[PDB]
Amino acid sequence: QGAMGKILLLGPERKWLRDFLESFEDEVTQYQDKLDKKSAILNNVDFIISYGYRYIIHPDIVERFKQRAINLHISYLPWNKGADPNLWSFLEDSPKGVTIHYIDSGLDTGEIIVQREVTYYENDTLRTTYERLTQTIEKLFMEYWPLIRLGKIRGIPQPKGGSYHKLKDKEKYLYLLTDGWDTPVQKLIGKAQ
Template identity: 45%
Template sequence: MNILFLGPTCPRIENLLRALGHFVHREEGRLSSDFSKNNFFNFCISYRYHYILTPSIIHAFQNGLINMHISLLPWNRGSDPNLWSFLENTPKGVTIHHIDETLDTGAIILQQSVYFDETKETLRTTYSKLSNAVESLFTDHVESILNRVLPYHPQPSGGSFHRSRDKIPFLPLLKEKGWDTPVGVLTGAGLGCAPRQPATSDKKVVSSLFDELPPRASSSKSKSTEKLSEHNFSDHSVF
């Protein structure tokens, strides 16, 4: 099978697919409008990808286009799902779902709840555990996913959606320790804000502080603060 992998490299998944005899081509940049005309793939996996896919690409893959998302959908669609799951004290987990033309709203294929001891965890450790959980969910069911034999169902109503800029009021909570902020100090801090639902025109947010791989630990407070401030908080596209 020819498989298109969208996003930063993930050796755990890419190596498994190749070991199973599949051809894997990875793209991290924006796909051209005629990409689907000039290339043939049987299946597409999006994981931390930074761009919106065009309708022509979505339709070309039909049900063979999936996203791996580190939240328990429909909670925390969009940007910074790990962070918001603590700020708004919502259910935590991971989801593998079909991609449709709206943000993180496609039918759910697989889900798994993830539980944390909030007295011991940080944003870094929870991000790592969520990433491991969604990758394990994929690898444990890889053949069934690729062969499209798993049942899927629409997402339930409700949930929440966040843009990258929505976290700006809470950055003071992260200023001192960044990725090493204990999640206990974040729990419930965003409950005064009504959950935002995605509009059809909304684009998925990335290049955000907590939707990408954690930066390496900094050796000084000033470096950590610089890392927080250098991120662009405008909306970017990703699945």
């Protein structure tokens, strides 16, 4: 390792993250749409970072980039795989936090690289807890990227257990979110048992 590389960032454009990665002398490209395994976007790519990427990455891409593709997920895996992890962490009163993991063929099931718990406070809202998770996982990424960049954390099998949600699962609970993002979380804790 140590050779200048090419990093593909999947998800929304984040100039701060592009700049951070380029300060290590790597070249960066960004993409937010679906990827066929033949896409030229993948040519000559050394490492993939997905952060808010909206699509399932095809298994042939996963295999081609074994141990070279990571995802930033704002849950404490194995809890709250999938959608709306912050909300579900309150509805199901689960552990809360953020996780950097290797991408495998399933959704948010790959090997864990590092995680961090994130606590909440009596008067937090979904907005304030979401923002804290976002800041925490961006911090955790930058804290550990100098090591990850050089293959120094091989990851561990994702513990068996936890939970998984699809985007539609929250519909029967939306009536609790009377103030949208500014709903106090206290109103939500345990409401899905």
